[PDB]
Paper text:
The bound peptide has well-defined electron density (from ThrP42 to GlnP50) except for several terminal residues. The buried surface area (BSA) of the interaction interface is about 591.3 Å2 within the average range of 400–700 Å2 for mAb–peptide complexes, accounting for 47.4% of the total peptide surface area. Specifically, the aromatic residue TrpP43 has a large hydrophobic indole group buried in a deep hydrophobic cage formed by AlaL34, TyrL36, LeuL46, TyrL49, PheL91, and MetH102, forming 46 van der Waals contacts and contributing a large BSA of 233.0 Å2. The acidic residue AspP47 is embedded into a positively charged cleft to form electrostatic interactions with ArgH50 and ArgH52.
Recently, we have developed a novel murine anti-osteopontin mAb, namely, 23C3, which is of great potential in treatment of RA. The Fab fragment displays a canonical Fab structure with four immunoglobulin domains of VL, CL, VH, and CH1.
Residue numbers in the entry:
A (entry chain L): 1 to 213
B (entry chain P): 42 to 50
C (entry chain H): 1 to 216
């Protein structure tokens, strides 16, 4: 079977920049190779077929080249919309195997997260549960540090975080952090703090609330 | 070929 | 134009069976070879099966991890592509794509979830600010969706009015149960002067909760 190895796994590209994704084939596959772009929550769209042929309704900035065993896709002056995950696939025999993928991010000027803190719902309390939610909205770059503080004492137990995919609109990221606790364990303290550390500043963005206030 | 509906390889 | 619409994907108990479907239109179906491709949540694309046209005696091809277990078939009279899936395993959980010929057109896909976890309606909570000391003209509000199975859920705001300012965060497994939050940024002129409501929908458990966000 033919093993397609793709490179690089991920790229952080700025608008106007040009970049090339390469993809090598274990065996000789002549020119039987296609390129796909996939956007999150969507089906892959065909970019280039038979290695060098631009498919219908695809920008001329997409250039496929290569034949034999080494292949590469090239994007000239990458646009904002060119975000996604790029895959190669050979079509020389069964099974058709794919490259491991190339995650493509849009490079952006740094932006601080807007932090929002939320106390456990009054509806959730009457159910015996208690979750404290913290939103960190529209920031760049991706990596971000969240820490919790109850009554001054830190918390690292029931904290579970979720990032979003970089959005097409402004190219930023968002992240929820949800501290889940007993519901009885909640009412034993009153002060609750959410600390966000990010590239933009060394001083953490603190958002807090008092249960007994 | 790619544009052939059902190519025989 | 050319279109391939998948259907049939749902929650299946492990070692269970499911038939998924692909409806084709906008091209001569009976001359084209067809195939199924899958994509596990978060992972890459895996080719699963291929089936040739009648003129080529319908010869079939499979992936080793699927052989003797999945059977690809087609009804040319109804421009339909099928995939019979028997003895389903955990690793067969994926988005299943209906692909034409060698890859020129892809369907939107149906999700297949192979789990022994039970279907559960979500608990919807409103997220409203607390304490005080507001440092922004825009106030962000949210909805917490707690303890549900399986995926997906659909969170919109105001019947679909609030298009921008909305962030919906993926999901997480803890104990065979999913949890996701949603956020919305609105002016203090708008809120609480207008009624901001979230519209959570869980297709499986036939759930449609609408929660209003009320000042504390
Ligand atoms: C799809 O399947 C069909 C049916 O299996 C298939 O069509 C058949 O193709 C074969 C050729 O491979 C044909 O068989 C030949 O028929 C001719 C004419 O009658 C005979 O002269 C041939 O006889 C020779 O070979 C024999 C050994 O099998 C010897 O005994 C003999 O001495 C000769 O040397 C041979 O039998 C067959 O007629 C067709 N059938 C039809 C209905 O057309 C087709 O190939 C498959 N499709 C594709 C594209 O692969």
């Amino acid at each position: 079977y033919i093993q397609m190895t793709q490179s690089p796994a991920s790229l952080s590209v700025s608008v106007g920049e040009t970049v090339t994704i390469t993809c090598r084939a274990s065996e000789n596959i002549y020119s039987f190779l296609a390129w796909y772009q996939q956007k999150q929550g969507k089906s892959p769209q065909l970019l280039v077929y038979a290695a060098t042929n631009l498919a219908d309704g695809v920008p001329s900035r997409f250039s496929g080249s290569g034949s034999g065993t080494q292949f590469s896709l090239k994007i000239n002056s990458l646009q904002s919309e060119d975000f996604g995950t790029y895959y190669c696939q050979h079509f020389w025999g069964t099974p058709f195997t794919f490259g491991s993928g190339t995650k493509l991010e849009i490079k952006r000027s740094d932006a601080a997260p807007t932090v929002s803190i939320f106390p456990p719902s009054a509806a959730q309390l009457s159910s015996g549960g208690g979750s404290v939610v913290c939103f960190l909205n529209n920031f760049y770059p991706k990596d971000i540090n969240v820490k919790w503080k109850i009554d001054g004492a830190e918390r690292g137990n029931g904290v579970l975080n979720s990032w979003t995919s970089q959005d097409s609109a402004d190219s930023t990221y968002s992240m929820s952090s949800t501290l889940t606790s007993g519901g009885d364990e909640y009412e034993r303290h009153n002060s609750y703090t959410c600390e966000a550390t990010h590239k933009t500043s060394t001083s953490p963005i603190v958002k807090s609330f008092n249960r007994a206030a | 070929t790619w544009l052939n509906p059902d190519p025989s390889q | 134009e050319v279109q391939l619409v998948e259907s049939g994907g749902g929650l299946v108990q492990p070692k269970g069976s499911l038939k998924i479907s692909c409806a084709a239109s906008g091209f001569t179906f009976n001359i084209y070879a067809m195939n199924w491709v899958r994509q596990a949540p978060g992972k890459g694309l895996e080719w699963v099966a291929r089936i040739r046209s009648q003129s080529n005696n319908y010869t079939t091809y499979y992936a080793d991890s699927v052989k003797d277990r999945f059977t690809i078939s087609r009804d040319d009279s109804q421009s339909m592509l099928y995939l019979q899936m028997n003895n389903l395993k955990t690793e067969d959980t994926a988005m299943y794509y209906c692909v034409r010929q060698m890859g020129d057109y892809w369907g939107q896909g149906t999700t297949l979830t192979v789990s022994s976890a039970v279907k559960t309606p979500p608990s919807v909570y409103p997220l409203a600010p607390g304490g005080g000391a507001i440092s922004n003209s825009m106030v962000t509000l949210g909805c917490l969706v707690n303890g549900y199975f399986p995926e997906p859920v659909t969170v919109t705001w105001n019947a679909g009015s609030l298009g921008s300012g909305v962030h919906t965060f993926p999901a997480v497994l803890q104990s065979d149960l999913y949890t996701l939050s949603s956020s919305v940024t609105v002016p203090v002129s708008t809120w609480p002067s207008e009624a901001v409501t979230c519209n959570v929908a869980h297709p499986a458990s036939a759930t449609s909760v609408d929660k209003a966000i009320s000042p504390v």
